[PDB]
Amino acid sequence: DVDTYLSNLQTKTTLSMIADGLERSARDFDAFLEENVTLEWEAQRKRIYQHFG
Amino acid sequence: SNADLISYFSKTADEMEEMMKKFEKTITEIEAHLTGVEAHAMAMQ
Numbered sequence A: 001d002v003d004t005y006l007s008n009l010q011t012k013t014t015l016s017m018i019a020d021g022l023e024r025s026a027r028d029f030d031a032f033l034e035e036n037v038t039l040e041w042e043a044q045r046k047r048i049y050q051h052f053g
Numbered sequence B: 001s002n003a004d005l006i007s008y009f010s011k012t013a014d015e016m017e018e019m020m021k022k023f024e025k026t027i028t029e030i031e032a033h034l035t036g037v038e039a040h041a042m043a044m045q
Helices: A002-007 A014-052 B005-044
Strands: none
Touching: A014 B005
């Protein structure tokens, strides 16, 4: 385990890698909003399908 | 034969003289590489 950990290690500050979580969140939020608005359009269409009958 | 080994020693010297340059080259490469590793990790984070 330690062998692979040292093999795949990069010379750089650790506090910068964890920071990437912010970027990843900012890039996931977009897709999450797109899923919100798609499940919303879906819901709306559904309620219309239950309005017409 | 004392005058003969001089070429041999100076030869080893001449040979090593470039091995040092190789060391410099590889070092410079390593710098140039790790500088990239930083970026890769800097994007990965």
